[PDB]
Design a protein around this ligand. Structure first.
Ligand code: 4WB
Ligand code: CL
Ligand code: K
Ligand code: K
Ligand code: K
Ligand code: ZN
Length: 409
């Protein structure tokens, strides 16, 4: 069927207006355009609201009115020469609108743009206009009800998933491939069995945001994983991985888990956060994934497997602090999505085509990232996860082969 992609003139300008992500969104969409992919894609315009009240209702489906009010005020304050008052500094500090989530003149418009894009993408799936929709301006998984976190101001993902589950029993499987734990999405749906969250990430002492690993409590008892609560018990899945993992080991770590979640949950929709900060070339320098398509990119391995399910899917961006390598990865994800969904082979030249941002792709100007890969707790994680999935299934009265599922591992 049809693959949609979110873009527009205003949308691009807003997505390029933040100090942390600068013109990343422009490199991504211009590289997709340089490879002649735009004619294969259905343009999905960002959602717009008939009034301020309708916009406030949509965003406050998740966020608190006082947080939305403070974010709106932070934008007003940064569009003026006047320094903040003592009480304004306190208000903004109370919502963590500082440190990693500072103010800037477009902070509200920028944050809301991601929401507009991901809501339009979910709408395009719900009405069956597209089988898959991509939004490289979204995936801000850390934003919480009343707190900015990890340069995430509004949780476009939580709001898109809310629109999906609220449609016509609808289950959503959320897969978070970002280097960082998908805490804001996991927390939003902590009490729901209808949205199952799965995050693979780095976890280590002092690494942001600290969650998605063993629960640290006062007793000498063996630590265990919190995995949701009430009717949501066992519905939040996490795989924390040590630094240094390559394409093949990360692919082997997640593949059986993805296969099992799909078979047991039978989701109506899949939402994938594809944060590019696991790339070997990300300045975090934690994981050693690639965008290679020959050893297969772990990212391309995961997207190909997800798309093989033929479940309507939303693919989102997220982290990725090496802008040219993020564009390299996300162009290949976009081409792979065209190939799997349209059944139309896409031949991408290994040389970056000439375009405005061509100089940004030095020094080799090739599509492969400039990295040469070289030379379990995971098996333990696999047994724990498999037991969690059996627990989730039993609690939610789902029937499944279980021998078939045990075999995948
Ligand atoms: C405002 N505040 C409320 C409480 C939090 C976060 C936001 C929250 C919000 C919504 C639903 C559940 C939860 N909690 C319970 C958990 C959900 C996910 C957890 C985890 O460790 N997963 O890996 S712990 C969070 C929490 C509680 C205590 C310590 C830590 Cl680190 C995190
Ligand atoms: Cl654009
Ligand atoms: K474009
Ligand atoms: K993640
Ligand atoms: K859940
Ligand atoms: Zn990240």
């Amino acid at each position: 069927m049809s693959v949609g992609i979110v873009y527009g003139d205003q949308y691009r300008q807003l997505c390029c207006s933040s100090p942390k992500f600068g013109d990343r969104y422009a490199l991504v969409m211009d590289l997709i355009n340089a490879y002649k992919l735009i004619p294969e894609l259905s343009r999905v315009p960002p959602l717009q609201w008939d009034s301020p009240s309708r916009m406030y209702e949509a965003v406050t489906a998740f966020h608190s009115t006082e947080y939305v009010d403070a974010l709106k005020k932070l934008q007003m304050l940064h569009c003026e020469e006047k320094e903040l008052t003592a009480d304004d500094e306190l208000l903004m500090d109370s919502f963590s609108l500082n440190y990693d989530c500072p103010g800037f003149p477009s902070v509200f418009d920028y944050s809301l743009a991601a929401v507009q894009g991901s809501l339009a993408a979910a709408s395009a799936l719900i009405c069956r206009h597209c089988e898959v929709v991509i939004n490289w301006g979204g995936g801000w998984h850390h934003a919480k009800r009343s707190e900015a976190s990890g340069f995430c101001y509004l949780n476009d993902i939580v709001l898109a998933i809310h629109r999906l589950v609220s449609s016509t029993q609808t289950r959503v499987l959320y897969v978070d491939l970002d280097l960082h734990h998908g805490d804001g999405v996991e927390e939003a749906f902590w009490y729901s069995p209808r949205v199952v969250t799965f995050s693979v990430h780095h976890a280590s002492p002092g690494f942001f945001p600290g969650t998605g690993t063993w629960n640290m409590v006062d007793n000498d008892k063996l630590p265990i994983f919190l995995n949701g609560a009430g009717r949501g018990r066992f519905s939040a899945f996490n795989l924390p991985l040590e630094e240094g993992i390559n394409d093949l080991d990360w692919s082997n770590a997640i593949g059986p888990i993805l296969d099992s979640l799909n078979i047991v949950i039978q989701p109506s929709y899949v939402v994938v956060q594809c944060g590019a900060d696991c790339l070997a070339t990300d300045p975090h320098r934690i994981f050693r994934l690639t965008n290679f398509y020959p050893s297969l990119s772990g990212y391309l391995y995961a997207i190909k497997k997800i798309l093989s399910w033929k479940v309507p899917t939303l693919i989102l961006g997220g982290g990725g602090y090496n802008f040219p390598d993020t564009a390299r990865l996300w162009t290949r994800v976009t081409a792979l999505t065209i190939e799997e969904v349209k059944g139309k082979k896409m031949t991408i030249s290994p040389e970056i085509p000439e375009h405005s941002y061509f100089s940004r792709y030095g020094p080799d100007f090739e599509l492969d990232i400039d990295y040469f890969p070289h030379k379990d707790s995971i098996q333990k994680h696999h047994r724990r996860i498999l037991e969690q999935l059996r627990n989730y299934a039993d609690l939610n009265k789902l029937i499944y082969d279980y021998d078939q599922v045990y075999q995948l591992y």
